[PDB]
Ligand SMILES: CCCCCCCC/C=C/CCCCCCCC(=O)O[C@H](COC(=O)CCCCCCCCCCCCCCC)COP(=O)(O)OCCN
């Protein structure tokens with residue numbers, strides 16, 4: 026025919042190729058080539074330990090100590106309490122007002138009890154504090170969705186009474202609830218999709234990814250960031266804006282890499298390992314936030330579980346139960362900022378209100394990046410907005426907690 | 432509807448997402464964040480020079496010296512000679528046998544003259560030697576395609592004589608030929624596609640990419656590879672296989688990064704700058720060789736110009752002018768290996784026949800990777816096959832030439 030068309034190079038902006046799966050395999054190949062010797066070393070050196078049954082027996086030796094696993098186990102009380110008020114109002118008792126009050130009390134207690142235990146106890150590690158508060162905020166969102174879905178499938182039955190798949194009143198079983206609580210999702214649903222089998226190879230690869238990226242994050246921190254912080258061990262709350270920026274410029278890129286590894290290690294490897302153990306089959310925990318040419322598209326695709334919980338339990342109901350789309354969006358912003366400063370600042374016992382100010386500054390930044398940049402330049406603007414952006418607030422919190430202790 | 436489908440995570444193999452444009456913008460953002468200060472520094476420090484008109488006047492001060500630009504300029508003699516035999520047999524003279532002999536003489540001279548000048552001159556730098564030989568092999572392929580296309584469009588006219596677009600005998604103009612010679616293509620064609628305009632912004636970005644990635648390659652070499660080579664300055668021709676491998680394991684990853692930057696800097700930035708200056712509009716210089724889950728698919732998409740020149744001037748004619756598809760493929764292999772060892776080993780004056788042995792070993796490696804691995808594991812196997820693969824042969828040549836001189 027004609028050996029020469031009129032086209033564009035694949036790497037060009039106006040080409041629209043977008044088939045770069047292989048820039049991922051390249052990053053995997055290079056991470057492995059660079060960390061595989063050390064990973065086999067640390068795996069034989071740490072995997073040879075007797076961790077599994079010794080740490081559990083040690084914790085069982087002194088309950089009421091190690092208050093973070095104590096909190097995580099006590100969360101079952103709130104789980105069972107929600108299940109009880111549900112299964113009790115499922116038949117005859119607790120007219121909707123009473124059940125809604127019991128559930129609101131249970132939810133507010135899920136939120137305010139672990140915060141209290143964390144603040145009013147000195148023997149609780151901050152990483153364990155964070156695990157307790159994150160488990161309890163996950164449980165809070167899960168039980169909020171539980172209440173909402175059961176209320177819906179109960180109003181529907183009450184209506185239709187005067188006109189394989191499990192119907193409404195037959196899903197209130199401890200098996201069901203405690204499968205939902207460990208499901209990689211925040212939106213309750215009768216008849217979750219299911220995977221055919223367990224795929225031992227997939228689960229093994231997920232566990233390997235978790236171990237590898239854990240060791241990689243440890244490398245990143247201990248060899249790029251802890252040295253840089255220890256060069257000038259001065260808290261951010263006392264430094265000035267100039268010195269703060271001079272230090273954050275040195276700390277940003279390692280912090281960004283650590284956050285990318287958190288995202289992968291958690292929203293792909295950990296959540297897929299969980300969803301594979303208990304066959305879950307949905308497995309859309311994230312969407313392509315990396316090719317997000319705006320901050321608004323970034324937030325709507327980072328953390329798909331939380332976002333769809335938001336959109337169908339906190340934003341759509343506000344539009345229904347009221348008006349002012351603007352007020353719904355600002356309420357979503359408020360809730361997200363509250364949960365961020367509650368996850369980052371209650372474990373570290375700080376309240377400098379930095380995560381909140383960063384979450385705020387995301388707004389003018391979002392308008393800026395949405396208005397000025399487009400396409401791949403907008404995507405690069407979003408990548409900048411993530412390198413400094415919000416993760417720098419969490420970095421400031423952790424930097425202050427590091428230099429104020431060791 | 433139903434908030435939970437049955438799907439897979441985007442990073443999973445069996446998902447088939449492949450929209451990772453944004454893992455590229457991330458690499459650009461990070462390369463810029465890591466090298467921008469130094470790049471502005473080296474640009475003000477090197478761009479302030481009076482390079483443009485001083486080096487040309489200095490070369491014009493002593494022609495017959497600097498033999499590499501002398502060779503590149505003398506290539507115009509072969510260009511004009513091919514154009515002359517064409518435009519002369521275009522009308523009445525040089526029956527096809529005579530014209531074919533003149534063109535074969537011209538081509539063999541294009542190949543054997545710069546090799547001779549390079550070998551039989553001591554004052555020629557190896558980088559300039561390589562530029563001369565690469566310009567002359569590009570000219571050879573271009574003129575081969577020129578001969579073939581004009582022969583075709585002349586046989587067609589001779590036939591049809593006894594039954595906007597430019598017809599055959601009206602394309603033989605110096606403007607046309609010397610546009611073709613500088614076109615980013617190896618396949619001649621009457622009526623090349625054309626771009627509408629010059630797009631000063633695009634050309635500026637291409638020049639910026641060329642400068643940036645040149646400085647980046649200089650950084651890579653001088654700060655990752657020259658130190659590593661100077662730690663043990665021992666030629667590869669004298670070391671044993673064990674020590675050779677011990678050193679190549681240390682040299683591979685920097686060599687691989689340098690080769691990726693060569694690929695980009697040349698097959699995208701340089702070729703697009705050229706194609707934009709002289710509006711060319713075709714601009715398919717490469718295809719997605721990065722997501723190539725086999726070595727055979729890699730070769731067929733790395734270097735699209737050379738590959739399509741191959742497929743429609745050296746492989747399809749052999750299938751036509753003969754048989755034995757196997758023999759056509761092995762002839763393609765032979766020609767590629769010859770040109771590789773002629774580009775890498777004539778400038779360095781070495782003839783250890785290493786590039787040839789690597790090009791050979793690509794064959795069993797290609798069968799291996801094609802048979803055993805699939806999908807993303809096949810792609811990772813190809814990435815391995817590029818990290819050690821063929822570029823290590825060129826690395827061995829350059830390492831020997833470095834340690835044997837400085
Ligand atoms: C004693 C000798 C030590 C050195 C030689 C042995 C090294 C062995 C390496 C072990 C590391 C294994 C864990 C790495 C972390 C990643 C785990 C993994 O398989 O990740 C997978 C990613 O893998 C890929 O993408 C393709 C496979 C990559 C294999 C790369 C092999 C490199 C060479 C190995 C040897 C390295 C030697 C280094 C010497 C300096 C998960 O894949 P997915 O595409 O996301 O989807 C799969 C589910 N659909």
Ligand SMILES: CCCCCCCC/C=C\CCCCCCCC(=O)O[C@H](COC(=O)CCCCCCCCCCCCCCC)COP(=O)(O)OCCN
Pocket residue numbers: 036037038039274401402405409456459460463464465467468470636639640643
């Ligand atoms: C104030 C002057 C500008 C900022 C400082 C200089 C930065 C370096 C300047 C130039 C080197 C650029 C090398 C790569 C060029 C990439 C061109 C481009 O548009 O990339 C695009 C993607 O990349 C971008 O958009 C990058 C935009 C910049 C992001 C990085 C941030 C720059 C500003 C802060 C710099 C701070 C440096 C100091 C840090 C301590 C699209 O890709 P493509 O394949 O190139 O296609 C374009 C044509 N269709």
Ligand SMILES: CCCCCCCC/C=C\CCCCCCCC(=O)O[C@H](COC(=O)CCCCCCCCCCCCCCC)COP(=O)(O)OCCN
Pocket residue numbers: 049050051052053055056059060245282285286288289315442443444454457655
């Ligand atoms: C020491 C290791 C050096 C590795 C250098 C090559 C790797 C390039 C670096 C980062 C890759 C960034 C990828 C795009 C980020 C957005 C998407 C994302 O979340 O990516 C995931 C996040 O991963 C990352 O961000 C990787 C972080 C890289 C940390 C690099 C540490 C370098 C340490 C210093 C090395 C010094 C070498 C010697 C210097 C003289 C990666 O996903 P995957 O495992 O590839 O998925 C495949 C599943 N089958």
Ligand SMILES: CCCCCCCC/C=C\CCCCCCCC(=O)O[C@H](COC(=O)CCCCCCCCCCCCCCC)COP(=O)(O)OCCN
Pocket residue numbers: 036037047048051249455456457458459461462465466651688691692694695721
């Ligand atoms: C504390 C530790 C020591 C200090 C930090 C040291 C950092 C410097 C060390 C190593 C980095 C050396 C350079 C690695 C990347 C080589 C260049 C490269 O891959 O070029 C790319 C070539 O890519 C291809 O041919 C596709 C296949 C390979 C995928 C690209 C991989 C890029 C890796 C980026 C790593 C990011 C961190 C770099 C840090 C300087 C050109 O792509 P582009 O510019 O993104 O184009 C899109 C816009 N049109």
